[PDB]
Each structure stands twice: as structure tokens, then as C-alpha cells.
Amino acid sequence: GIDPAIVEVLLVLREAGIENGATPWSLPKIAKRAQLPMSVLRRVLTQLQAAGLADVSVEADGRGHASLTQEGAALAAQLFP
Template sequence: MPESSAPEADQLDPAIAALLAQLWRAAQDGRPWSLPRLCKQSGLRMSTLRRCLTLLAELELADMELDESGRGRAWLSAEGLALCRGLFAPES
């Protein structure tokens, strides 16, 4: 996504912005976060989190992994990292 067309964080749906911010934090930790941790940190209900992650996955901005019991984890894709770097990284 070209930088000139990248949205500002305040132009995003609040749930998407909250989730992207937490996925960005997880990327800074260097590992995917569990879905329950993403819920707690973003303040989203699990159903909202799953819908948002599905949308981000369809847009190729995030990936998630779910096991048979429904537990899972999520992380930013390369495209998602580039977007979040523009949204959340301090300008140098």
C-alpha cells in the first residue's frame, strides 16, 4: 500500500485500530499473541476480535492460527507490519 494512501489510525474503525495496535505491540515482542491476550489488551470481545481478524486476514494484513479446540494466536503479515509501521512507529 503506497504511503500516500495509507489511512491514519483515527480514520480506521475503532475495533480494527485497537486490534492493529495490539498486533503491532505483539510484533515488537517478536511473537504472536494468543486470542485471549489480544482480547484483553484491545478491549474487544472474542466475537468482535475474530470478525476483525477475519477481515484483516482477507485483506492480507494479518494471519491467525486456530486449533481444534478453538484456541489460537494471531500476528501481522508483512503487509500488516508495513501498514502498522506507518500508523504507529515514531517518525525518525
């Protein structure tokens, strides 16, 4: 019964953050690795950002990057052991 798009984005963001101090991935890279159209990725990130699990950082042109918050990162490690 689980939304596979939310799960896939959580998995991709967890992978992105495994190397400490790594640059957060850009939105198109997240979309590519999650195999999601950009519109779906944006929806999922809005929901994860609302939930306090992801940071979504965009500039004036609407482009940018996203990553797990400290909350999301710690939870993702447990949810997907």
C-alpha cells in the same frame, strides 16, 4: 468515521510484534489488551486476515493466536508512526 475496533486490534498486534522472534499472542490476550469481547476480536481478525494484514492460526478446538503478516507489520509502522 473509522471503526475503532479495527484500529485497536492493529495497534495491539503491532505492539505484539515489536520484539523480533516473539511468540504471537493468543486470542484472549489480544482481546484483553484491545479491550474487545472475543466475538468482536474474531470478526476484526477475519477481516484483517481477508485483507492480507494478519495471520490467524487456530487448532481443531478453534483456539490459537494471531499476528501481523509482513505486509501488515510494515504498514502498521507507517500508519501509527
